[PDB]
Amino acid sequence: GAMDYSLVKALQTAQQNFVISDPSIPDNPIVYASQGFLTLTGYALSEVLGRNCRFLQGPETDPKAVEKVRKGLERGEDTTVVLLNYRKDGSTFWNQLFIAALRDGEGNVVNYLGVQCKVSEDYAKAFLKNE
């Protein structure tokens, strides 16, 4: 459950932008989305639950950034990327995206956490250069 994790409760209380996915459901869809995520992206909660978060990507999103995310998920490593994302209205923003495994007491991945932060184009260019 989403509220099993004190990090999730903290981010909820702090009114941050995040989602929780469930990799045991086909296509690793979102099972919880914060209000901040909804406001950032322009989607209603009923439009995001049950969907993989790739709906935020579009033609100007760098496929190499998406590949870094993919590899983090396949290798079990926490990961930070900066990539271009799209709101429901088609407007774009740079997203500094953090994805981490949420584990049980035996080490199994039960859920993934993704935390989104809108950053400026200038911040994004500097981040990508430094990577």
Number of helices (H) and strands (E) in the chain: give both, helices first. 5, 5
Choice from 48, 114, 117, 124 touching ligand FMN (CB under 6 A): 114
**What ranges in the chain are assigned the alpha helix state H?**
6-13, 35-41, 45-48, 63-75, 121-130
Long-range interactions of 9-14: CB distance < 8 A, separation 24+: 11/115
Which partner from the list Cl ion, ligand FMN, none does 95 bind, CB cut-off 5 to 8 Å by kind? ligand FMN
Q: Footprint of ligand FMN on residues 35-54 (CB under 6 A)? A: 52-54
* 8 forms part of the interface with ligand FMN (CB under 6 A): no
* 101 forms part of the interface with ligand FMN (CB under 6 A): no
Q: Which residues contact 88 (CB under 8 A, 6 or more apart)?
A: 41, 42, 43, 47
Query: How would you classify the pairing of strands 92-103 and 79-86?
Result: antiparallel
* 34 forms part of the interface with ligand FMN (CB under 6 A): no
In 3D space, the residue among 58, 25, 40, 27 whose CA is nearest the CA of residue 115 turns out to be 40
Q: Footprint of Cl ion on residues 61-120 (CB under 5 A)? A: none
Q: Footprint of ligand FMN on residues 71-90 (CB under 6 A)? A: 73, 83, 85
Interacting residues with ligand FMN (CB under 6 A): 19, 21, 28, 52-54, 56-57, 66, 69-70, 73, 83, 85, 95, 97, 99, 112-114, 116
Known binding-site positions for Mg(2+): 46, 49
